[PDB]
């Protein structure tokens, strides 16, 4: 129980972060970056479409991989809302309780 919870809590300061980051995007270039662009966009100006805004040196230093050596997952447009952010627990995988359950922005709240 201790280390899955330890586990979940660093997942979800990672998603809160990464949201922060990607609402700092938004502010500076008027849109968030697409599924194709994708987390790195935080990290380096991406392309296609290239942002008219970007920060010199991004949103954030490094990305975070979430507590099971995995990259986090990020959909714009999203399925859940306007944009996901997401890991999907310790299987990898959609679906699963305990430590395999899905943890996004969508329902941080519900682990909290
Ligand atoms: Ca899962």
Same mark, same amino acid.
């Given at each position: @129980?201790?280390?899955? %919870?330890? $586990?979940?809590? %660093?997942?979800?300061?990672?998603?809160? &972060?990464?949201?922060?980051?990607?609402?700092?995007?938004?502010? *500076? #270039?008027?849109?968030? =970056?697409?599924? $194709?662009?994708?987390?790195? &966009?935080?990290?380096?100006? =991406?392309?296609?479409?290239?942002?008219? #805004?970007?920060?010199?040196?991004?949103?954030? %230093?490094?990305? =975070?991989? *979430?507590? +099971?050596? #995995?990259?986090?997952?990020?959909?714009?447009? /999203?399925? %859940?809302?306007?944009?996901?952010?997401?890991?999907?627990?310790? *299987? /990898?995988?959609? @679906? @699963?309780? @305990?430590? &395999?359950? *899905?943890?996004? #922005? +969508?329902?941080?709240?519900?682990?909290?």
């Amino acid at each position: @129980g201790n280390k899955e %919870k330890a $586990d979940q809590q %660093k997942a979800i300061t990672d998603i809160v &972060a990464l949201e922060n980051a990607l609402d700092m995007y938004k502010l *500076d #270039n008027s849109v968030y =970056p697409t599924t $194709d662009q994708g987390l790195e &966009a935080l990290v380096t100006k =991406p392309s296609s479409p290239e942002p008219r #805004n970007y920060r010199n040196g991004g949103y954030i %230093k490094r990305l =975070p991989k *979430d507590p +099971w050596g #995995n990259e986090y997952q990020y959909m714009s447009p /999203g399925d %859940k809302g306007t944009i996901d952010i997401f890991t999907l627990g310790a *299987d /990898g995988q959609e @679906g @699963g309780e @305990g430590a &395999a359950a *899905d943890i996004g #922005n +969508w329902n941080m709240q519900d682990f909290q």
